[PDB]
Amino acid sequence: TTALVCDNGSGLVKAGFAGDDAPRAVFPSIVGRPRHQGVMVGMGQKDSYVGDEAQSKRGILTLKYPIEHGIITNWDDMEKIWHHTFYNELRVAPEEHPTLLTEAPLNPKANREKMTQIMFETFNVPAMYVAIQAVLSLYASGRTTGIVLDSGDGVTHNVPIYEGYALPHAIMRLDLAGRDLTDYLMKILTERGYSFVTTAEREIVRDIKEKLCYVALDFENEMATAASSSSLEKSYELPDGQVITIGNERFRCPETLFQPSFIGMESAGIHETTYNSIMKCDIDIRKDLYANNVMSGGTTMYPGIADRMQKEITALAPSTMKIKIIAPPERKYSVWIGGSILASLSTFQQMWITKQEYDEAGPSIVHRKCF
Amino acid sequence: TTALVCDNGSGLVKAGFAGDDAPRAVFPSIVGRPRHQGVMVGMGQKDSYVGDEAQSKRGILTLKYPIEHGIITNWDDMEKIWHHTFYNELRVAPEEHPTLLTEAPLNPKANREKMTQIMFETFNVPAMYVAIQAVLSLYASGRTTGIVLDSGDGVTHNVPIYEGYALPHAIMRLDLAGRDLTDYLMKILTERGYSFVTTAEREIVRDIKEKLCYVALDFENEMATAASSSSLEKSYELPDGQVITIGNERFRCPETLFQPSFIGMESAGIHETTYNSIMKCDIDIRKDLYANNVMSGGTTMYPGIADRMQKEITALAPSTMKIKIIAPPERKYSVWIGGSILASLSTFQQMWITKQEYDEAGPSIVHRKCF
Amino acid sequence: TTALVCDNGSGLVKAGFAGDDAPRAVFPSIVGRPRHQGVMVGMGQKDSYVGDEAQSKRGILTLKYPIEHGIITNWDDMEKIWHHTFYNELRVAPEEHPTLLTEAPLNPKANREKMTQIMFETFNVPAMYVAIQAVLSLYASGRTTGIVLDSGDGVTHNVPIYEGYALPHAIMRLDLAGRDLTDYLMKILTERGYSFVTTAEREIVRDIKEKLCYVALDFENEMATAASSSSLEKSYELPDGQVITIGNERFRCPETLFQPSFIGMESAGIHETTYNSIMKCDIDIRKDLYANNVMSGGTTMYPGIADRMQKEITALAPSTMKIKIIAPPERKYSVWIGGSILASLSTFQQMWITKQEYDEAGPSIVHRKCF
Amino acid sequence: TTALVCDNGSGLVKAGFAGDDAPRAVFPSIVGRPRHQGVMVGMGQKDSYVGDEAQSKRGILTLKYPIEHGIITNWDDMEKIWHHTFYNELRVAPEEHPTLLTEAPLNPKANREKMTQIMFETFNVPAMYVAIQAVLSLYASGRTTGIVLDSGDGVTHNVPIYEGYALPHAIMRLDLAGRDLTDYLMKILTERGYSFVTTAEREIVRDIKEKLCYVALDFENEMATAASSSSLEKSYELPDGQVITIGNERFRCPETLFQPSFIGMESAGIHETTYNSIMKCDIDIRKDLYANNVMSGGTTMYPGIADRMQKEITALAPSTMKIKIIAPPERKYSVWIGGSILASLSTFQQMWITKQEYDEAGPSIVHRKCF
Amino acid sequence: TTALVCDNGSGLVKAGFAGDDAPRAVFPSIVGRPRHQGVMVGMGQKDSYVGDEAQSKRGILTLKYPIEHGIITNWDDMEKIWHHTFYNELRVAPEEHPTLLTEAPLNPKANREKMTQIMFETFNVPAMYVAIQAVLSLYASGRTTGIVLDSGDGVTHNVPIYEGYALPHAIMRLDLAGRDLTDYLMKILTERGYSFVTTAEREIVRDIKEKLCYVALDFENEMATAASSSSLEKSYELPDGQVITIGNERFRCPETLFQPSFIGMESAGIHETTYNSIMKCDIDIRKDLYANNVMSGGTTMYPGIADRMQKEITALAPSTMKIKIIAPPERKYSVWIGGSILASLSTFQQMWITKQEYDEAGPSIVHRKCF
Amino acid sequence: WXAXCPA
Amino acid sequence: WXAXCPA
Amino acid sequence: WXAXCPA
Amino acid sequence: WXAXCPA
Amino acid sequence: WXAXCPA
């Protein structure tokens, strides 16, 4: 009578039921394995931990992300996460009803192939569909025209859509994403005088980022200010009680999105990419696209990021254009929300790939029945 | 109790009811089909757009003109336009009352044949009549003697009429028309430094032409002036906010009508053709024809075109002749207006082709009952 | 020891030497000028082409006929053709010996004046003579009494001759000629659904006419037949490989000679004109004239034209008259042949206009020594 | 005593001396700038690399193409390339003798203006001339009539020429070119499972294309075959030793030329454009144009492209036409070769623009003395 | 007229003059303080010993290393060592001429800040410069491209350099270093049956390591062999005359570099880190980097370490790559040697930070003038 | 059309 | 260019 | 991936 | 001509 | 250091 909706992308796993206005299962896509000799007999432990388990005992566990840059690499672990998701988190047998999976655009074909197969073979899912995340963001916004900027953990991408009719030749994909920012920050902190190198420590850094970092509207003068004022400095307490103080790193990390070159990322800045996608669209619709830029994903949560995008685009764009950055509260869950909407849509029903069809056509059907 | 009157020619479609002093339905004869993959399920879209719909979403749609040079080529699309015209624009069931259609002189027979049939078969129109557009222009002017120059989008033609009694051997037909001027302009703009190649872009160019171009009375010195003065230059804002500046192209495009050779059009200039039609008339009436030259159609809207015609004819014609170029405001709708007049004429009633007659004689009746 | 004989009339130029039984130089009276920008340096081209050169490259060249309706209008080009004729075609220096030129009766005086002068000034021709083409046709036939109907490209005319003693008051001249038929046909083809408008295309049409058209002996029922049978239809391959099909136009064009009104030509039909010329002759010789009607010129090549003339005259003429239409094979070259004969005639010698005489009397001599 | 000839178009730069049968300087039109912090003092490096230098160290350098779609955009870098060309490659002082430059038809006027000026100001070149590349291709072929298809890196174009006399109204220009194919291929490879995003990586992709891709004569069944057979698959070794395997992408990329819509390119396919250019020519010469289609430029090197063109045209063209695709070995250098020929032509000498003339008329002379 | 060059890193202090081919001052970076009650009045002792003094009387002294993991922690003692270095060892007043200091990449900013200041305040050094040790190693090798592996006492790091242009985003830093190996070995020896716990004893262990340990090329079978053969066992005489015998510990300690997990070091093995640094470099230069791997520092002295690296990399790398491990004699002094070279380089001169500049800008200049 | 022009 | 394309 | 990046 | 027709 | 390690 319903369907499962989930954001099986990088970073976090979001899941719930169609029609729900919020995911209930929200936890890290992390698999952990111990790297020390277990001693106490009777400890009652396992050789694999997932999500919150992994975070809870990260000082012992070696943590891995099955998903890298939106690509599933460790299929065994991937399977485990889904297993956990369905039974431990959602408390539901997926075999009973259809599931909506999502992905970033432009992934190696095989990624879809195996996803499809697993759903049919391990989970024996009644029906399934793979959707592009950017598209889902528009459903969340309730708009048919705009440019979706989905910037998650492993991947950032741009999909211009005009009353539907997505324009594939204008889709941009950028590797530079939250995970890279995290890594970069670690190196910056070394400069400041703090060392983080274990995987657990990496996660701590992530926590820091998510709380303290913000986007400057004038990076140059932001640094000028930082260089002469403790007002930008801010303290933070680490898990063992130590207190650290962040200086100009608080905004230097975010800046990377606008200047990828900081990490050797040859590619253009996020606002240039955005702009370029528009440039690949016909002059007739460019205006509308400027009107509806839509933010989406966890990295769009940095304070001021909207304003920075606005400024940057304003500069690149022609004058008297209505540059509007749509960036609503809860945009962190945009995609998942859109999924709930789409799944609840009755019309959508005829897009499901059935097992029947799978059996007859094979896994290649995902490149024909499903967009 | 009335009748439909329409200009089903190239370019725009004009339509209204007999007795009306202006057409109410005025929109492009354009059919649009999407050329991108529709993605958003529930978008509520169609596989075919017409007129304003087409213009509105031209950045997505591939736009076509069913009519080329006054010849209907894509009958399916033609039908669609008429369908739209009657029900979406006019909001009237054509089956209820007679319709006046028009055409340029000297069209492939089959053009009339199919028009007639469609009206009787698809629309089941009570009665119909096909009129030559030039003739209608005189009714609009209220004159029985003159030379009508109907210069539309796909075709330009000359019909000398003397108290009725049109002279068929003197009718001239010229392919060079507004659509060609548009195309030519596109190439000229390339020189200036602007590229327009999509169909949507073509339409933009058309818009430009209609606003900025004008006719010089001394093309040679007009260029001499342009070459040394920004006073001829004029800015224009494109749909995406970019601003362009037009130089001497502003009058070079119009000039083509007087020098067709610019586009490889071997044919004589529009004023030479006009003149030649007069030359094919007997000396006794030539004088009167010089007195009443009548402009008609959208291309006669370029500022100064009347004066240019006057000058050119004056040069070719004998001295002391009253060369008068009649070029009233609203001449853009001349034909349609004339149609309204003619249709309202009670005497005219006996020219209608009835379905009865059609059934008995067949479609060939259009070459015998109808002029 | 000999003389040049040529048909310098409209259409084609025929030339050869006196005593020859056929012209060797047979080519179009056409001058061509390029209307496109020459690009390839070293192309080795000229700014003027003649005859076969013109036909060969007619897609590039603008083609003109110096002669219109039997009147030389473009003297420069006229000169060029003669130049070509003498040196490129005949391969002979005309300065060496006398030349016979021809013309249609009733031409503007000046036409002869300039012809004469040019021959004496540009070509320095030893002696010359201008003859009426109709007369020459009789020499070709070997008859002294008859009515010659010379119907060429630009002009048709009738000259009744009775044992010599031509009757000038009965000479008829008709503008309606092959070139007009060609033009008319072009318009008819538009109806059928084919467009021909360039000068090159005009020439193509001419080719078509010359191959497919024929004369009906019952135009009315010919149409009745055509209207219900593909047996009259006939295919034809155009230069670019396209195939066209001609319907009733195949005989409608020829019909114009019998009904000039089709092109607005007020004048009586060719058979009425013929008849009328006879009516202007005294009753005593009318009988003989009916006996010897002589066809002559390219337009008398349409299949059945003789029979049609016969029928038409038979109807107009009194009963029991021997209406005979003389229409021998090779009548297309009649005039030229006659010229060869006349020139070879030794008696004729005393009709030559010498340069001596020209110098003394001036060009006006052509209206006194020469008929 | 001689002259420089070069192909200063997009992609590669070709250069040599007039009379040479092959260019000696053949290298990429690429300028490179480092994007990493130089550390080793004494490294002896520069801030700008050209051609082979750029390729050699492309992993460090940011590579740019001054020329985009046949338009010079980065004039500073353009200058640098020419500088390199003359002194580092050709080892010659250009100031000593005349230079032939080339371009695609229909470029923004200013492009020529600056080229001209630079040659006179930076290089102080004795004389110069700008030629249309298509024209030069005919000189290479030794023909005066044909249609040249010059399909290079940034631009493809069609120029119909008939014994010289190029027909400007029929010249077609198409943005879709080799550089776009390269870009497209990159996206396709993503599907296969390979990521290329840096500029250096772009160049690698180009290399791949040039070695492995070929044209199918039945794209549909080519895919059907590919889908079930490794016989189409082919391995390739990347610079770091990794081996990749190409599947159906090997022919899918080339296909784009026949179906531009793959990259959102609304425009008609290359064979349709070719055909259309012919359609814009008068029926009289169309036949000859079908006989001489001439391939030219690097993209015409894909195996089977000739056959594909032949097939496509054959389908569009009338039957029994001699569709011949001229596609000789070394057609990749066609233009340059033609340049050598033209420059060696002594007649050509009078087409040179001298500095004298430049000084007097100004840079605008390039639009009057030079075609 | 010269400059001081020194390796002020962890472990040992190396120092000499620019242009020297070997350091003359080579002694431990150790400060010693007595921990017993001095009794004999007149003993003539001090409360602080340095280097050889410390080693000589290590049974009494508590020995400390001011430097830990490449970070200066005990600044007072640091100062003392430098003092000793300059006056007791080098016998030179540093105030007279410039000094080159070195460091590992990615150190807490403050480390540089204080170093700079001390040089200017305590020693009043004319000019100074801080260089990255890895870079210096290349100067020693005379190469501009390669990957330097500097593995010292407190820190190991990887810096990929390509014709200069070091790639900062690919620099790796690893805590696992010689000092840790020493510590680990101590624990292993406990297993064998020997206890070492005093700081002096730690130093003894270090001595042992440096003489007896070697790298296996097959750790697994090396153990298999050890387990059944005294041929691997080797005796050693301790300072008090006791003789000990080392078993499989002789190669187990070295192994830790390839399996850091032995000491709880989560981080990847040294060969994996090396490899990963390469992976962070663009495919275009990866080949060259494989060709030039450069060993550097005391830990690269274990017999067979080169071969082990070769094997490990060979396994990870693509086939047919030229994996070359450059590991020349005297690589233990690589950095110092490079320093001598660089300092002697005359070009280098313009990199010196002068006191003038320091006074004006402050210590922060070290992050701008100096790399 | 079916001859000269492309109509 | 300055209009359609990005040249 | 199997080319640029390390996916 | 110079009157009726256009010759 | 002041975080992970004990420097």
Ligand SMILES: Nc1ncnc2c1ncn2[C@@H]1O[C@H](COP(=O)(O)OP(=O)(O)O)[C@@H](O)[C@H]1O
């Ligand atoms: N509140 C926050 N502020 C800033 N960055 C955040 C925040 N929450 C998450 N992020 C970053 O965004 C990424 C996860 O967001 P999400 O969009 O769910 O990724 P994904 O969509 O790929 O699951 C991580 O890199 C995370 O650190």
Ligand SMILES: Nc1ncnc2c1ncn2[C@@H]1O[C@H](COP(=O)(O)OP(=O)(O)O)[C@@H](O)[C@H]1O
């Ligand atoms: N205001 C205007 N000024 C100049 N040209 C115009 C104007 N309006 C229309 N045109 C041109 O005239 C043509 C349309 O006019 P119209 O006479 O209605 O064509 P048609 O009669 O064939 O519908 C188009 O080519 C159009 O661009």
Ligand SMILES: Nc1ncnc2c1ncn2[C@@H]1O[C@H](COP(=O)(O)OP(=O)(O)O)[C@@H](O)[C@H]1O
């Ligand atoms: N075989 C033919 N059949 C029908 N008409 C022809 C034929 N040959 C020529 N004509 C027409 O007759 C004219 C040329 O014939 P000709 O008598 O030589 O003209 P002219 O005498 O004026 O040179 C042209 O209009 C030509 O098309």
Ligand SMILES: Nc1ncnc2c1ncn2[C@@H]1O[C@H](COP(=O)(O)OP(=O)(O)O)[C@@H](O)[C@H]1O
């Ligand atoms: N051997 C080849 N096979 C296929 N494509 C090629 C080959 N060589 C070059 N190309 C492509 O053709 C273009 C360069 O050819 P060229 O005609 O010299 O361009 P341009 O004429 O604009 O210099 C590039 O896009 C290149 O990749």
Ligand SMILES: Nc1ncnc2c1ncn2[C@@H]1O[C@H](COP(=O)(O)OP(=O)(O)O)[C@@H](O)[C@H]1O
């Ligand atoms: N001959 C040797 N064999 C093996 N290890 C050595 C040798 N000499 C020194 N080491 C180890 O290398 C380190 C010192 O080398 P060095 O590179 O000078 O360190 P640093 O560069 O940090 O001064 C110490 O841990 C030392 O024990």
Ligand SMILES: [Mg+2]
């Ligand atoms: Mg996401």
Ligand SMILES: [Mg+2]
């Ligand atoms: Mg109209």
Ligand SMILES: [Mg+2]
């Ligand atoms: Mg004749």
Ligand SMILES: [Mg+2]
């Ligand atoms: Mg080229």
Ligand SMILES: [Mg+2]
């Ligand atoms: Mg060291």
